[PDB]
Amino acid sequence: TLVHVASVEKGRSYEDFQKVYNAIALKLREDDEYDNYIGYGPVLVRLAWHISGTWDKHDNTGGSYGGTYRFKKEFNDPSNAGLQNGFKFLEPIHKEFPWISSGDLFSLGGVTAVQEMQGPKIPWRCGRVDTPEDTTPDNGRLPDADKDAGYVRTFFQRLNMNDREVVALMGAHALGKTHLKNSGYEGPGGAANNVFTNEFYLNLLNEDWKLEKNDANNEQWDSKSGYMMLPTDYSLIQDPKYLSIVKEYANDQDKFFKDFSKAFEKLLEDGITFPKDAPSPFIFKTLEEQGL
Ligand code: HEM
Ligand SMILES: COc1cccnc1
Protein backbone atom coordinates (compact mmCIF):
# COMPACT_ATOMS: atom_id res chain seq x y z
CA THR A 1 0.00 0.00 0.00
CA LEU A 2 1.28 3.33 -1.39
CA VAL A 3 0.92 6.33 0.93
CA HIS A 4 -0.17 9.66 -0.56
CA VAL A 5 0.03 12.48 1.91
CA ALA A 6 -1.97 15.65 1.22
CA SER A 7 0.35 18.59 0.82
CA VAL A 8 -1.26 22.07 0.70
CA GLU A 9 -0.22 24.10 -2.40
CA LYS A 10 2.39 26.42 -0.93
CA GLY A 11 0.93 29.36 1.03
CA ARG A 12 -2.66 28.79 -0.25
CA SER A 13 -5.80 28.99 1.87
CA TYR A 14 -9.61 28.95 1.56
CA GLU A 15 -9.75 32.29 -0.34
CA ASP A 16 -7.38 30.99 -3.06
CA PHE A 17 -9.61 27.96 -3.67
CA GLN A 18 -12.83 29.99 -3.60
CA LYS A 19 -11.29 32.03 -6.45
CA VAL A 20 -10.71 28.82 -8.47
CA TYR A 21 -14.29 27.68 -7.62
CA ASN A 22 -15.60 31.09 -8.76
CA ALA A 23 -13.65 30.92 -12.04
CA ILE A 24 -15.10 27.44 -12.77
CA ALA A 25 -18.64 28.53 -11.77
CA LEU A 26 -18.48 31.68 -13.95
CA LYS A 27 -17.28 29.66 -16.95
CA LEU A 28 -20.13 27.16 -16.30
CA ARG A 29 -22.58 30.04 -16.54
CA GLU A 30 -20.88 31.51 -19.63
CA ASP A 31 -20.40 28.43 -21.66
CA ASP A 32 -24.07 27.53 -21.65
CA GLU A 33 -24.59 26.08 -25.17
CA TYR A 34 -22.49 22.94 -24.67
CA ASP A 35 -24.28 19.62 -25.24
CA ASN A 36 -27.52 21.18 -26.52
CA TYR A 37 -27.70 23.64 -23.64
CA ILE A 38 -27.14 21.09 -20.90
CA GLY A 39 -23.90 22.96 -20.19
CA TYR A 40 -20.68 21.61 -18.71
CA GLY A 41 -21.96 20.77 -15.14
CA PRO A 42 -22.66 17.00 -15.78
CA VAL A 43 -19.40 16.28 -17.64
CA LEU A 44 -17.42 17.97 -14.84
CA VAL A 45 -19.16 15.71 -12.27
CA ARG A 46 -18.37 12.66 -14.38
CA LEU A 47 -14.71 13.76 -14.75
CA ALA A 48 -14.28 14.08 -10.96
CA TRP A 49 -15.82 10.60 -10.50
CA HIS A 50 -13.72 8.91 -13.21
CA ILE A 51 -10.42 10.34 -11.97
CA SER A 52 -11.31 9.07 -8.51
CA GLY A 53 -12.96 5.76 -9.54
CA THR A 54 -9.66 4.20 -10.67
CA TRP A 55 -8.75 3.75 -7.00
CA ASP A 56 -8.04 0.28 -5.61
CA LYS A 57 -8.27 0.07 -1.82
CA HIS A 58 -6.07 -3.05 -1.84
CA ASP A 59 -2.84 -1.28 -2.86
CA ASN A 60 -3.82 2.41 -3.11
CA THR A 61 -3.19 2.54 -6.84
CA GLY A 62 -5.31 4.92 -8.98
CA GLY A 63 -7.45 7.53 -7.22
CA SER A 64 -7.68 11.33 -7.49
CA TYR A 65 -4.42 12.21 -5.76
CA GLY A 66 -1.96 11.95 -8.66
CA GLY A 67 -3.87 13.90 -11.35
CA THR A 68 -2.95 11.09 -13.76
CA TYR A 69 -5.90 11.72 -16.12
CA ARG A 70 -3.56 14.34 -17.73
CA PHE A 71 -1.56 11.39 -19.16
CA LYS A 72 -2.55 9.78 -22.42
CA LYS A 73 -3.00 6.18 -21.14
CA GLU A 74 -5.80 7.46 -18.86
CA PHE A 75 -7.06 10.31 -21.06
CA ASN A 76 -7.60 7.67 -23.80
CA ASP A 77 -9.27 5.02 -21.63
CA PRO A 78 -12.36 4.00 -23.60
CA SER A 79 -14.28 4.33 -20.27
CA ASN A 80 -13.31 8.04 -20.35
CA ALA A 81 -14.66 8.80 -23.85
CA GLY A 82 -16.23 12.31 -23.78
CA LEU A 83 -14.39 13.55 -20.66
CA GLN A 84 -11.93 15.42 -22.93
CA ASN A 85 -14.72 17.99 -23.08
CA GLY A 86 -14.44 18.54 -19.27
CA PHE A 87 -10.65 18.60 -19.47
CA LYS A 88 -10.80 21.21 -22.24
CA PHE A 89 -13.19 23.27 -20.12
CA LEU A 90 -10.76 23.23 -17.17
CA GLU A 91 -7.68 24.14 -19.29
CA PRO A 92 -8.12 27.93 -19.11
CA ILE A 93 -8.89 27.65 -15.41
CA HIS A 94 -5.60 25.78 -14.87
CA LYS A 95 -3.78 28.38 -16.98
CA GLU A 96 -5.17 31.14 -14.79
CA PHE A 97 -4.34 29.26 -11.55
CA PRO A 98 -1.24 27.29 -12.50
CA TRP A 99 -0.45 26.66 -8.83
CA ILE A 100 -3.40 24.25 -8.28
CA SER A 101 -2.58 20.53 -8.71
CA SER A 102 -4.37 18.58 -11.46
CA GLY A 103 -6.16 16.23 -8.97
CA ASP A 104 -7.27 19.25 -6.95
CA LEU A 105 -8.56 20.98 -10.10
CA PHE A 106 -10.39 17.91 -11.49
CA SER A 107 -12.05 17.10 -8.10
CA LEU A 108 -12.86 20.78 -7.46
CA GLY A 109 -14.53 20.94 -10.91
CA GLY A 110 -16.95 18.19 -9.77
CA VAL A 111 -17.69 19.90 -6.44
CA THR A 112 -18.25 23.27 -8.20
CA ALA A 113 -20.58 21.68 -10.77
CA VAL A 114 -22.74 19.91 -8.17
CA GLN A 115 -23.09 23.08 -6.03
CA GLU A 116 -23.71 25.44 -9.00
CA MET A 117 -26.43 23.06 -10.25
CA GLN A 118 -28.20 23.60 -6.86
CA GLY A 119 -26.93 20.35 -5.37
CA PRO A 120 -25.77 19.82 -1.79
CA LYS A 121 -22.65 21.54 -0.46
CA ILE A 122 -19.74 19.15 -0.79
CA PRO A 123 -16.87 19.84 1.61
CA TRP A 124 -13.59 19.66 -0.29
CA ARG A 125 -9.96 19.31 0.82
CA CYS A 126 -6.89 20.50 -1.09
CA GLY A 127 -3.46 18.85 -1.21
CA ARG A 128 -3.49 16.31 -4.06
CA VAL A 129 -0.01 16.26 -5.66
CA ASP A 130 0.68 15.51 -9.31
CA THR A 131 2.52 12.19 -9.73
CA PRO A 132 4.60 10.95 -12.72
CA GLU A 133 3.36 9.20 -15.84
CA ASP A 134 4.37 5.76 -14.55
CA THR A 135 1.82 6.02 -11.69
CA THR A 136 -1.08 6.25 -14.23
CA PRO A 137 -3.44 3.29 -13.60
CA ASP A 138 -4.11 0.90 -16.51
CA ASN A 139 -7.48 1.11 -18.33
CA GLY A 140 -10.35 -1.16 -17.22
CA ARG A 141 -10.81 -0.03 -13.57
CA LEU A 142 -14.04 1.93 -14.26
CA PRO A 143 -17.35 0.03 -14.31
CA ASP A 144 -19.23 -1.66 -17.19
CA ALA A 145 -22.86 -0.55 -17.72
CA ASP A 146 -24.28 -3.81 -19.12
CA LYS A 147 -24.22 -5.78 -15.85
CA ASP A 148 -26.46 -6.56 -12.87
CA ALA A 149 -26.78 -5.69 -9.17
CA GLY A 150 -24.21 -8.30 -8.02
CA TYR A 151 -21.66 -6.79 -10.42
CA VAL A 152 -22.35 -3.23 -9.14
CA ARG A 153 -22.07 -4.33 -5.50
CA THR A 154 -18.79 -6.16 -5.97
CA PHE A 155 -17.35 -3.42 -8.17
CA PHE A 156 -17.92 -0.74 -5.56
CA GLN A 157 -16.35 -2.82 -2.73
CA ARG A 158 -13.01 -2.03 -4.45
CA LEU A 159 -13.78 1.72 -3.79
CA ASN A 160 -14.81 0.90 -0.20
CA MET A 161 -18.45 1.90 -0.91
CA ASN A 162 -21.38 0.09 0.74
CA ASP A 163 -24.95 -0.26 -0.60
CA ARG A 164 -26.17 3.13 0.67
CA GLU A 165 -23.08 4.92 -0.75
CA VAL A 166 -23.54 3.17 -4.11
CA VAL A 167 -27.24 4.07 -4.37
CA ALA A 168 -26.57 7.69 -3.29
CA LEU A 169 -23.71 8.13 -5.78
CA MET A 170 -25.76 6.74 -8.64
CA GLY A 171 -28.29 9.62 -8.19
CA ALA A 172 -25.81 11.67 -10.20
CA HIS A 173 -27.28 9.91 -13.23
CA ALA A 174 -30.06 12.48 -13.09
CA LEU A 175 -27.42 14.80 -14.62
CA GLY A 176 -26.45 15.14 -18.29
CA LYS A 177 -27.07 12.18 -20.59
CA THR A 178 -25.61 9.14 -22.21
CA HIS A 179 -24.20 9.80 -25.71
CA LEU A 180 -24.13 6.97 -28.24
CA LYS A 181 -20.74 8.03 -29.68
CA ASN A 182 -19.10 8.03 -26.25
CA SER A 183 -20.47 4.95 -24.50
CA GLY A 184 -22.82 3.08 -26.83
CA TYR A 185 -25.85 4.31 -24.82
CA GLU A 186 -28.20 7.18 -25.64
CA GLY A 187 -30.45 9.49 -23.72
CA PRO A 188 -31.06 11.35 -20.46
CA GLY A 189 -32.29 9.91 -17.17
CA GLY A 190 -34.86 12.65 -16.67
CA ALA A 191 -36.15 16.13 -17.48
CA ALA A 192 -34.05 18.27 -15.23
CA ASN A 193 -30.65 17.26 -16.37
CA ASN A 194 -28.65 20.27 -15.36
CA VAL A 195 -30.18 20.82 -11.92
CA PHE A 196 -29.15 18.42 -9.15
CA THR A 197 -32.29 16.73 -7.73
CA ASN A 198 -33.45 13.25 -6.62
CA GLU A 199 -35.21 12.72 -9.98
CA PHE A 200 -33.13 9.60 -10.81
CA TYR A 201 -34.92 7.68 -8.01
CA LEU A 202 -38.39 9.04 -8.79
CA ASN A 203 -37.95 8.09 -12.44
CA LEU A 204 -36.68 4.58 -11.64
CA LEU A 205 -39.79 3.97 -9.54
CA ASN A 206 -42.44 5.86 -11.49
CA GLU A 207 -41.62 5.54 -15.19
CA ASP A 208 -42.81 2.54 -17.27
CA TRP A 209 -39.49 1.11 -18.46
CA LYS A 210 -39.10 -1.11 -21.54
CA LEU A 211 -35.99 -3.12 -22.33
CA GLU A 212 -34.91 -2.06 -25.87
CA LYS A 213 -31.90 -2.08 -28.12
CA ASN A 214 -30.36 1.26 -29.08
CA ASP A 215 -28.62 2.01 -32.39
CA ALA A 216 -25.32 0.66 -31.08
CA ASN A 217 -27.00 -2.73 -30.54
CA ASN A 218 -26.81 -2.42 -26.71
CA GLU A 219 -29.74 -2.97 -24.40
CA GLN A 220 -31.07 -0.08 -22.27
CA TRP A 221 -34.31 0.56 -20.47
CA ASP A 222 -36.43 3.30 -22.09
CA SER A 223 -39.58 5.17 -21.02
CA LYS A 224 -42.29 6.84 -23.15
CA SER A 225 -41.09 10.17 -21.65
CA GLY A 226 -37.80 9.77 -23.58
CA TYR A 227 -35.70 8.81 -20.52
CA MET A 228 -33.29 5.88 -20.30
CA MET A 229 -31.58 3.75 -17.62
CA LEU A 230 -28.47 1.61 -18.06
CA PRO A 231 -28.77 -2.06 -16.97
CA THR A 232 -26.61 -1.10 -13.92
CA ASP A 233 -29.10 1.70 -13.04
CA TYR A 234 -32.07 -0.63 -13.45
CA SER A 235 -30.35 -3.20 -11.21
CA LEU A 236 -30.97 -0.79 -8.31
CA ILE A 237 -34.70 -1.64 -8.48
CA GLN A 238 -34.16 -5.37 -9.25
CA ASP A 239 -32.08 -6.01 -6.09
CA PRO A 240 -34.27 -5.83 -2.94
CA LYS A 241 -31.60 -4.10 -0.81
CA TYR A 242 -30.89 -1.45 -3.40
CA LEU A 243 -34.65 -0.98 -4.00
CA SER A 244 -35.30 -0.07 -0.35
CA ILE A 245 -32.67 2.70 -0.57
CA VAL A 246 -33.96 3.90 -3.94
CA LYS A 247 -37.39 4.33 -2.31
CA GLU A 248 -35.84 6.14 0.64
CA TYR A 249 -34.11 8.71 -1.59
CA ALA A 250 -37.19 9.08 -3.87
CA ASN A 251 -39.06 10.11 -0.71
CA ASP A 252 -36.52 12.32 1.00
CA GLN A 253 -34.63 15.01 -0.93
CA ASP A 254 -32.65 16.23 2.07
CA LYS A 255 -31.53 12.76 3.08
CA PHE A 256 -30.43 12.11 -0.48
CA PHE A 257 -28.47 15.43 -0.55
CA LYS A 258 -26.74 14.70 2.74
CA ASP A 259 -25.84 11.09 1.80
CA PHE A 260 -24.66 12.07 -1.68
CA SER A 261 -22.45 14.84 -0.23
CA LYS A 262 -20.73 12.45 2.18
CA ALA A 263 -20.22 9.68 -0.43
CA PHE A 264 -19.02 12.08 -3.11
CA GLU A 265 -16.48 13.71 -0.81
CA LYS A 266 -15.36 10.23 0.27
CA LEU A 267 -15.01 9.11 -3.38
CA LEU A 268 -12.91 12.23 -4.18
CA GLU A 269 -10.68 11.66 -1.10
CA ASP A 270 -10.11 7.87 -1.32
CA GLY A 271 -6.39 7.07 -1.18
CA ILE A 272 -5.39 10.35 0.45
CA THR A 273 -3.81 10.63 3.85
CA PHE A 274 -4.63 13.94 5.52
CA PRO A 275 -2.10 15.04 8.18
CA LYS A 276 -3.65 15.69 11.60
CA ASP A 277 -2.85 19.39 11.23
CA ALA A 278 -4.12 19.70 7.64
CA PRO A 279 -6.72 22.45 7.13
CA SER A 280 -10.34 21.51 7.82
CA PRO A 281 -12.40 20.74 4.69
CA PHE A 282 -13.49 23.85 2.77
CA ILE A 283 -17.14 24.63 2.06
CA PHE A 284 -17.29 27.01 -0.90
CA LYS A 285 -20.02 29.58 -1.35
CA THR A 286 -21.95 29.39 -4.62
CA LEU A 287 -21.95 32.39 -7.03
CA GLU A 288 -25.55 32.99 -5.97
CA GLU A 289 -24.61 33.07 -2.29
CA GLN A 290 -21.88 35.59 -3.09
CA GLY A 291 -24.20 37.79 -5.22
CA LEU A 292 -21.95 37.12 -8.19
C1 HEM B 1 -22.20 1.27 -12.09
C2 HEM B 1 -21.58 2.46 -12.04
C3 HEM B 1 -21.68 3.44 -13.25
C4 HEM B 1 -21.78 3.16 -14.56
C5 HEM B 1 -21.78 1.76 -15.23
C6 HEM B 1 -21.83 4.41 -15.27
C7 HEM B 1 -21.97 4.54 -16.63
C8 HEM B 1 -22.21 5.72 -17.29
C9 HEM B 1 -22.32 5.85 -18.72
C10 HEM B 1 -22.21 4.64 -19.68
C11 HEM B 1 -22.49 7.17 -19.00
C12 HEM B 1 -22.66 7.86 -20.37
C13 HEM B 1 -21.31 8.44 -20.82
C14 HEM B 1 -21.52 9.14 -22.15
O15 HEM B 1 -22.06 8.49 -23.07
O16 HEM B 1 -21.15 10.34 -22.29
C17 HEM B 1 -22.53 7.90 -17.76
C18 HEM B 1 -22.70 9.25 -17.65
C19 HEM B 1 -22.59 9.98 -16.49
N20 HEM B 1 -22.21 9.47 -15.25
FE21 HEM B 1 -22.09 7.43 -14.76
N22 HEM B 1 -21.80 5.47 -14.36
C23 HEM B 1 -21.70 4.91 -13.10
C24 HEM B 1 -21.62 5.61 -11.91
C25 HEM B 1 -21.57 7.00 -11.80
C26 HEM B 1 -21.26 7.74 -10.60
C27 HEM B 1 -20.87 7.04 -9.28
C28 HEM B 1 -21.29 9.07 -10.88
C29 HEM B 1 -20.98 10.28 -9.98
C30 HEM B 1 -21.27 10.40 -8.68
C31 HEM B 1 -21.65 9.19 -12.29
C32 HEM B 1 -21.84 10.36 -12.99
C33 HEM B 1 -22.22 10.48 -14.30
C34 HEM B 1 -22.56 11.76 -14.92
C35 HEM B 1 -22.70 13.15 -14.23
C36 HEM B 1 -22.84 11.40 -16.38
C37 HEM B 1 -23.27 12.36 -17.50
C38 HEM B 1 -21.99 12.86 -18.21
C39 HEM B 1 -22.34 13.82 -19.34
O40 HEM B 1 -23.54 14.15 -19.47
O41 HEM B 1 -21.40 14.23 -20.11
N42 HEM B 1 -21.78 7.90 -12.80
N43 HEM B 1 -22.33 6.97 -16.73
C1 LIG C 1 -26.20 10.43 -17.15
O2 LIG C 1 -25.93 9.01 -17.38
C3 LIG C 1 -27.08 8.35 -17.24
C4 LIG C 1 -28.32 8.90 -17.61
C5 LIG C 1 -29.49 8.13 -17.41
C6 LIG C 1 -29.35 6.86 -16.87
N7 LIG C 1 -28.12 6.39 -16.56
C8 LIG C 1 -27.02 7.07 -16.75
| CATH number, residue 221 | 1.10.420.10
Residues facing 187 on adjacent strands: 178
Closest-approaching ligand to the CA atom of 184 = 1
Q: In this structure, are 119 and 32 located in the same domain? A: yes
The secondary element (H helix, E strand) that includes residue 219 is strand 219-222
Q: In this structure, are 169 and 96 located in the same domain? A: no
d(CA 70, CA 64): 11
User: Ligand 2: which residue has its CA nearest to atom 8?
Assistant: 173
Residue of 36, 38, 49 to mutate, ligand 1, most atoms within 8 A of C-beta = 49
Q: In this structure, are 64 and 113 located in the same domain? A: yes
- Show the domain range for 64: 1-142+264-292
* 246 Cβ below 6 A of ligand 1: no
d(CA 103, CA 268): 9
Tell me which method was used to determine the 3D structure. X-ray
Tell me whether residue 214 is exposed, middle or buried, using C-beta atoms within 10 angstroms of its C-beta: 0 to 12, 13 to 18, 19 or more.
middle
Closest-approaching ligand to the CA atom of 226 = 2
Query: How far is Cα of residue 161 from the mean position of the Cα atoms in its chain?
Result: 14
d(CA 11, CA 9): 6
Nearest residue to 201 via CA among 151, 263, 245, 148: 245
Query: How far is Cα of residue 142 from the mean position of the Cα atoms in its chain?
Result: 12
- What separation in angstroms does the CA of 287 have from each of 19, 21, 116, 166, 185? 11, 9, 7, 29, 33
Q: In this structure, are 101 and 118 located in the same domain? A: yes
Q: In this structure, are 259 and 283 located in the same domain? A: no
Q: In this structure, are 118 and 163 located in the same domain? A: no
CA of 95 to the centre of ligand 1 (A): 27
Roughly what angle, to the nearest 10 degrees, separates helices 102-116 and 41-52?
140
d(CA 196, CA 49): 16
The resolution of the experimental structure, rounded to one decimal in Å, is 1.8
Alpha carbon distance, N-terminus to C-terminus of the chain: 44
How many domains does the chain fold into? 2
CA of 181 to the centre of ligand 1 (A): 14
- Whether 86 contacts 40, CB under 8 Å: yes
Per DSSP, the three-state class of 178 is strand
Query: How far is Cα of residue 111 from the mean position of the Cα atoms in its chain?
Result: 9
Nearest residue to 166 via CA among 245, 251, 48: 245
d(CA 116, CA 121): 9
Tell me whether residue 151 is exposed, middle or buried, using C-beta atoms within 10 angstroms of its C-beta: 0 to 12, 13 to 18, 19 or more.
middle
